[PDB]
Amino acid sequence: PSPTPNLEIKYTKIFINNEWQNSESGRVFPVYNPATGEQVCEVQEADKADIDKAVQAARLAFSLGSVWRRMDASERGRLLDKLADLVERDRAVLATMESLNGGKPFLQAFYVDLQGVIKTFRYYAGWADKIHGMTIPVDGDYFTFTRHEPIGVCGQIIPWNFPLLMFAWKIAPALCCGNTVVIKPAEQTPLSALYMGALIKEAGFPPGVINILPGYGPTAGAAIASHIGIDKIAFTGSTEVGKLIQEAAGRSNLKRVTLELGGKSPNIIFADADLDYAVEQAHQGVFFNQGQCCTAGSRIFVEESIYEEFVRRSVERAKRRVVGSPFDPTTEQGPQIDKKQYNKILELIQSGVAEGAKLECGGKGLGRKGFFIEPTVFSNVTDDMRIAKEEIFGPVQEILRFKTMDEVIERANNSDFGLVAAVFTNDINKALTVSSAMQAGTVWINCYNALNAQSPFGGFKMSGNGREMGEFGLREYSEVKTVTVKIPQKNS
Amino acid sequence: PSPTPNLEIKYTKIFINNEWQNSESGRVFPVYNPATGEQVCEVQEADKADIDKAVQAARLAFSLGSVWRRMDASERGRLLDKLADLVERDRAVLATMESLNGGKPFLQAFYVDLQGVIKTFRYYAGWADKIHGMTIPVDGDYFTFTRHEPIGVCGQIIPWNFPLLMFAWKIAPALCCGNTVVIKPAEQTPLSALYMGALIKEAGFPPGVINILPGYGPTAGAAIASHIGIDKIAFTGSTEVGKLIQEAAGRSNLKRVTLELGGKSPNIIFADADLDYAVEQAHQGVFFNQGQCCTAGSRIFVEESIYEEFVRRSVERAKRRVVGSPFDPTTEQGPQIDKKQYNKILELIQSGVAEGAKLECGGKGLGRKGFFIEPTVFSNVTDDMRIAKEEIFGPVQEILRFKTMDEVIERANNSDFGLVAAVFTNDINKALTVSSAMQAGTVWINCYNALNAQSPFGGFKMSGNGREMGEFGLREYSEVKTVTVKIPQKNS
Amino acid sequence: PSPTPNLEIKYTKIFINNEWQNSESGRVFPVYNPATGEQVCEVQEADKADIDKAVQAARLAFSLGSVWRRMDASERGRLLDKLADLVERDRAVLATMESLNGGKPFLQAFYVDLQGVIKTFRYYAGWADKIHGMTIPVDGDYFTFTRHEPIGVCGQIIPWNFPLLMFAWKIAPALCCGNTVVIKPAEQTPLSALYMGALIKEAGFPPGVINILPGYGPTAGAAIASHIGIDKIAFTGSTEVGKLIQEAAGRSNLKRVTLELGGKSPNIIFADADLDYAVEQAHQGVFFNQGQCCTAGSRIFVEESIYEEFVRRSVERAKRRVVGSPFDPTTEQGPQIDKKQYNKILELIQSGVAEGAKLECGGKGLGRKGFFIEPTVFSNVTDDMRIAKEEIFGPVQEILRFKTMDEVIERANNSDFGLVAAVFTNDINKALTVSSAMQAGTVWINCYNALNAQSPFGGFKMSGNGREMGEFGLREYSEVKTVTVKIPQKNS
Amino acid sequence: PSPTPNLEIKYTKIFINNEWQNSESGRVFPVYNPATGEQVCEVQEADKADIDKAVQAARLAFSLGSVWRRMDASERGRLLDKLADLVERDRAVLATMESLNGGKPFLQAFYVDLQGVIKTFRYYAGWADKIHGMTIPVDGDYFTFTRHEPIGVCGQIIPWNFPLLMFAWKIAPALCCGNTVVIKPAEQTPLSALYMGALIKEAGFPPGVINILPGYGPTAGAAIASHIGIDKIAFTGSTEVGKLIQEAAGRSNLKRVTLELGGKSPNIIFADADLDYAVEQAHQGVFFNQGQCCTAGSRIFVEESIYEEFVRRSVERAKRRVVGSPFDPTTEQGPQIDKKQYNKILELIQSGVAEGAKLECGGKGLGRKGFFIEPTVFSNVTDDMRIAKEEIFGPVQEILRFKTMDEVIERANNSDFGLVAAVFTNDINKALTVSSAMQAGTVWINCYNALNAQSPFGGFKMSGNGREMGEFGLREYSEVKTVTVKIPQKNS
């Protein structure tokens, strides 16, 4: 494939009740291309008044007897597979939008992000008519069963690093279970989500089942979090804002909350691992998606015996990483999302140099149009450095050294975060020992960034609350109702 | 059985690391007999300082390599079985304590509460080695499985109306899953829980696995809810304080939260129901446990054609209900828990009179000592009235009337609470149409207050988050870890 | 829609390894149109030698590292999705084949049979990547999990009354689980199965994954049952042949056996039921698909109170039932499948008149071009008549009477069959007492012949071994492997 | 612990309906001590007449409304828990019985066998009230759920090699699901089964729930297998008799069959394994329980690099393995069960020598009384020798050499059996690949042989059908009934 020539941006308004609407305020906000600095377009900016209209539409779409509630579960599923067909048909357009808006290299957006988008929808198409309750051999003369009903109106808030993929991870399980959705994409990256609105009507979802409100966090986002007519909030973003979400939910509605927050994830390389493979996988674990991954392996612990050769190979690999235009096939790494993130990264890079960490390569911006940063590698990192403790969310790799398994297990878990972790070793006893010991929601053995819709994903400690994806992720999108019926005698 | 005659209150101290302790302040607080107002004893009052060393004890009990962590899961179950055996052995003393301290009729405490305590422990003893993760057929060369691990230190706060039963409902699933516990019982009712510390010790639970910290809400409770060393909090359950729990969770360390909150539950009697049976069930729905049940019971909708006869027989039965001393085997209704609850019920009765409800019987307290209230019946109650909107934790029955199944489904669901519902009818279509439409975590058909250990319990809307009991009660007490292993080839 | 007029039957060969083949012997057998007597075409006649080639094809396709074994589970589902796409496209052709070969009215074959096929494939397409093993909290220093793998070559033998739907019901769960399949359609109706072979090739299934061998029972069928290279057999047919299947499995290689066998299923009508509706449901419950249904409600028990009028409304309805050519929209009931079944009906019909039941209507053939039988109703049937103990499998409705609920449960259960049962009533206690006490694999309340891919289906007693359809159906097509790993220490 | 010095055999009668009966013929059969040949006692010999009486006791105990059908599921768990308490109490007596009757070293029977009996009952005691059906979201206006009823009367036949344990493996899941049981222990070892009858009566099981009929294969065993009043047969034993059981069940009443039929299980030692640990574990894998183990690692494959050292260490360990009296705490190996087994082992050893396998130690009987055989090791075994293909059930170790993982995968799997397998390696890729390619119901990695109550256990291919133990063991003891209710509207 190749990028869509002269990409037309035709969906820029708020999506409520399957209709495109203006701001109630009249205000719009700009969208920028992080590779060039230019302004792509203006998007209608949602605020509290627009959220209330979205919630009203989602609440009416969910009313008993409505088309969405009466629909056969198997038909919710076919609606989700139809959306997958449409995203497949419009694949190159959508990957061009994610590239133009998110700075993702186009071929990565096409073959990675968009593939996961289509697979997520097809996976949850299969689940809709396979959500089961139970019947229970209860004490006494009763017949007891549970029903797994949709919760109702689900408010969803997502960040900017995987716009289209996040969108699908949120709405696919929600819809599969029969909920209706008020979703606020990141203000940095609203474009693909809005295009998804057109596909969503084209697929034939009833009006109001999905409502897409682009806008800012403290306005549209905080309106969702505090709204009294929203039954559930799924939030993905930073840990500090996640604290605000949980506070707002208790203070307002006691709405149910899922949190997917930040990480500072350890990647543990043992000496007996394949050096070629572990170096490239730890390099991808840092630099994938411009380093803007919550799953970034940002604390690479290397066994003493190989640390020095590991540093040499990682440095060579980072020194060859092709930075440049996302539309160029050779580009490995695009720009950071915006200037605020760009500066956040460079000040962090300065912090590591000001502390005692050896800067092997990189360290500076590139000076080009946009927000490009040189692939950066620190060695001699110690656990006390800001670099080893704060989420960089940029193309900065940090290599630490360790001696014994007990040591590195302690140090990997010595963190307020616990999103993910990885171990590289051919030894089965320390593979399972380390993986069992990690306080993280996902552990990889001899791989990294293996995420899919089939597998539960979420954080330990302050990295989140609850789980997304897989059969477990469906639990957060239904309510359990126990029906107990008095019966004359009961046998079995 | 009969009450243990003199009853010594042997256990009045704080239970930390399997040792009895004085409060760090040296303060004690009194405990009263609700039927006479007399002071039963004084109990060591835990504050922030005792919470601190309880969490320290529980965290050490939870560290890798500890006796509790290394134990076979099946042997976790055995301890829960030994604990139930000890409760069954001392069943009379515990029933006397629940009666003396909580005002429950002793026979009710013996045959209902204490049976529900023994069965809770035996149910979850069996679950301990049957908590399964899964293996997932993901895309690509991967072996993906999930482990369910304990969350860690669980802080637990319970109310006063079912002291021993709620204590079991809280510690049993937590221990079944391998957690350690810091539990604060209600300041009114700490005696049953403290006796359990003695039986927890005699059963052989490792030190620090369970710590029992009597004290008050703004001190011991708020220290638990904000404690940055507690990984999960389970709360029961006024809805006002529930908001503060969830806010304090997001404000502190984003600990996982389960809430079991208030209720104002509808009971719908259709004309085609066994009238004699429905009158006695709806009467037990409001007056059971002195009306101090989250599952009342408190909005009885009766179809027009049987409304006069239903009211007539309800008033006949309330007037016959035997209020008196809990130790007396003829007593059906003991006192309310204390003066503040007594006053709240009497004020809500006044507001019912002051709004057009027909005070058919009752309305005032009984006698001069203790906190006895007459069984009170209101008919001609309408939705907008305060008594119909706010929960009266007291012996106060409110009878509304209805035509049409659709009307009463609207009126039943029109509520911020959704803990419980019941429908009485012999028609299968009515029973299933109404139970499916109810916005409540538990719907009983032709019965009321059927709360078995095998079946989950929890609220819709502002009545709580998450579920207790059943297999689903386990879900709140485990963290899910996904382990994804790269493999050479992969075949089905 | 209207049938494909003069339809060529293109596919008449044996389907092995995605190739069309002649029988080893060179023998062919005739296929007849049952509404007309005339010969439709000639089909290659498989025997033991062809079954051996097919098994060899299925075993090689199942070998480790083959395309079918290495395919992602999600891609198995996509293949099942494509098959449904194709069946939908050629829906008119396949319904026409089902009429012309099985004698079902084309309208009911287009809107019932072929909808069941498309929905079955689509359902099991979703299960493919959702078949999960478990991880087990086992005693000792061990890590234990289970894999759910395909069993291998599955032999499948199906009858003639729902040829295409039986075909889907068999291969869809088998392929969803990753097995390879040797299937033998009924000698009477191989044509839609053989057409499905061409769509299977077009859809993309690897060679050898599905092999279709038309032929007779004692030759092709017995070859499958005693083949030492087949790991599992799924047989649907008569009870007498089912005994031979289980016996042949035991004598050969102990292949796993699921049997779906005969039925003489009860249908209980209480007075407190909607006569209008219940009469039409009991009518369809025995006359649907020309009475050639294993689920046929062939023992209609009616409460004395309404026996009178039930017979009158049933007879009035049967005398109106339109018998005619399958391609005519007005036809409700086509012919029986062949002369053997035809003569079996009337012979059993004669026993009814000779044993003392009132022939209320029908009871004879039509103008003998095709095997048409006039709709027949026996009233005053007793429990010991041949008409009440033996499967008639034709348009014959037996109506008995009963007085007491306990009497009718005893009478309905007095049978060696137990495939299905139905109770019509509006009383919840009666509906639940009767359904719980029925010795039947499927109990319908206030409906009949409600069957989906989603629901487990099978016989109690001599009506079957094992279950098909739904999730429980998947268990039969999968083999459990427990893997236990020694670990250095367990933390639980 | 020490043996129960004299041990009178108290219980020698047929156990039906909780009463001890004489045989209908009056005949008794002798029970021998395998260490001395001396007769231990006489036991009533059950035959067809006795099975008939036992089936109607079990059938009446299973009737709707009986004590066993009406009892709370949880109460069945309590009874199973009581049986474990009683076995625990009489652990010394039962271990002495198992040792005296079965020849097991007393310490082995006390600490291994009896611990497994107790833990089996306590595991399934927990499952009784946790057997759930489901509620299914089907198309149309339906409420579909499933109930998991008991099947009915379950006949059960077990061998002599783990008499008490396999008794526990059979009845625990059957009773946990609520069936009634007619169980025939092996003619060699009926004593500990009969003593359990005393404990079953003492534990409070209703009469007829468990009936124990000691007797012989073709007489009492075959009458069980072909009985038309038995709904399910659970058989553990040889593949040859397993064929007859499955054949008998097809020819009689189509009862449900599960088969556990033993094997010829491969044990693969890679060069990168903990060598001394592997030598000891492969030794135990062969010589545990006098080699009379269906799990016996009878084909140990050793990588050529370490073959010579492995053989030498195996010869040393085998030559120092203490053979002697079961009651001596020094004894690791007791006698074989009887003269038939002794002779069959001695012949097979002769076959190995005649066919060129190198006999490194042992090969002859030991002494003049009892059935002791010298521990025996065969050096250079090849896959085509009779000893490499046939189950020996004796203290005979067979060591083969191999070069390549893919070679040893083929050779391990080239067999009609597939009960169990093991691999020893520290490489994670070798352990995963080999465990996934094994055609065996249980694969151990770096151990042998961990059989818990939590883990399913059964054979591939001709090693059996279905599974025992764990949660999957309960699936064979329940029928599934689908109930489908028509409902007016349905809202998803």
Ligand SMILES: NC(=O)c1ccc[n+]([C@@H]2O[C@H](COP(=O)([O-])OP(=O)(O)OC[C@H]3O[C@@H](n4cnc5c(N)ncnc54)[C@H](O)[C@@H]3O)[C@@H](O)[C@H]2O)c1
């Ligand atoms: N879980 C398992 O898979 C497992 C466990 C232990 C043993 N085994 C196998 O059992 C066999 C050892 O026992 P065995 O060969 O001495 O006993 P066996 O196969 O001859 O008989 C086993 C049981 O079946 C009874 N029996 C014998 N003939 C019968 C007949 N015609 N009809 C009905 N019942 C009959 C016997 O009385 C006995 O109780 C070994 O092959 C072993 O592999 C399998």
Ligand SMILES: CCOc1ccsc1C(=O)N1CCN(c2ccc([N+](=O)[O-])c(N3CCCC3)c2)CC1
């Ligand atoms: C010595 C290992 O100890 C352990 C360790 C963890 S658990 C367990 C245990 O409890 N044991 C006792 C039953 N063990 C056994 C061995 C061989 C056979 N066998 O027949 O091949 C059988 N059985 C087959 C089905 C029932 C008995 C059982 C050995 C494992």
